[PDB]
UniProtKB/Swiss-Prot annotation, chain A:
The chain holds residues 497 to 545 of 1273 of the full protein. It comes from the Viruses. Changing N5T: In strain: 19B/501T. Attaches the virion to the cell membrane by interacting with host receptor, initiating the infection. The major receptor is host ACE2. When S2/S2' has been cleaved, binding to the receptor triggers direct fusion at the cell membrane. When S2/S2' has not been cleaved, binding to the receptor results in internalization of the virus by endocytosis using host TFRC and GRM2 and leading to fusion of the virion membrane with the host endosomal membrane. Alternatively, may use NRP1/NRP2 and integrin as entry receptors. Residues 23-45 are annotated as: Disordered. Binds to host ACE2. RBD also interacts with the N-linked glycan on 'Asn-90' of ACE2. Cleavage of S generates a polybasic C-terminal sequence on S1 that binds to host Neuropilin-1 (NRP1) and Neuropilin-2 (NRP2) receptors. Interacts with host integrin alpha-5/beta-1 (ITGA5:ITGB1) and with ACE2 in complex with integrin alpha-5/beta-1 (ITGA5:ITGB1). May interact via cytoplasmic c-terminus with M protein. May interact (via N-terminus) with host bilirubin and biliverdin, thereby preventing antibody binding to the SARS-CoV-2 spike NTD via an allosteric mechanism. Changing Q2R: In strain: Omicron/BA.1, Omicron/BA.2, Omicron/BA.2.12.1, Omicron/BA.2.75, Omicron/BA.4, Omicron/BA.5, Omicron/BQ.1.1, Omicron/XBB.1.5, Omicron/EG.5.1. It comes from Severe acute respiratory syndrome coronavirus 2. This is Spike protein S1.
Length: 49, 43
């Protein structure tokens, strides 16, 4: 690899993420962001589980 | 799931377990998957 090489021949760092599910509890989870909560009003809610 | 519950209390007795009631709260819930068979203590 040289700095003067063509961009087609320049070095590129590659990372391949694979997600493996087995016969075991799922332990890697996403962020799962939340929203604001409102009181004294009929709401359909989704708490932790 | 590997549940580990615990509880602490004072005691004044040596030769046997104390008679009485007390509940044990949950402390650890390990998300592992190692089918256990045996164990051992370390003192």
């Amino acid at each position: 690899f040289q700095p003067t090489n063509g961009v087609g021949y320049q070095p590129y760092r590659v990372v391949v993420l694979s997600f493996e599910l087995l016969h075991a509890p799922a332990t890697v989870c996403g962020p799962k962001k939340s929203t604001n909560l409102v009181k004294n009003k009929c709401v359909n809610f989704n708490f932790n589980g | 799931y590997f549940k580990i519950y615990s509880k602490h209390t004072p005691i004044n007795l040596v030769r046997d377990l104390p008679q009485g009631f007390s509940a044990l709260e949950p402390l650890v819930d390990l998300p592992i998957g190692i089918n256990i068979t045996r164990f051992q203590t370390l003192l």
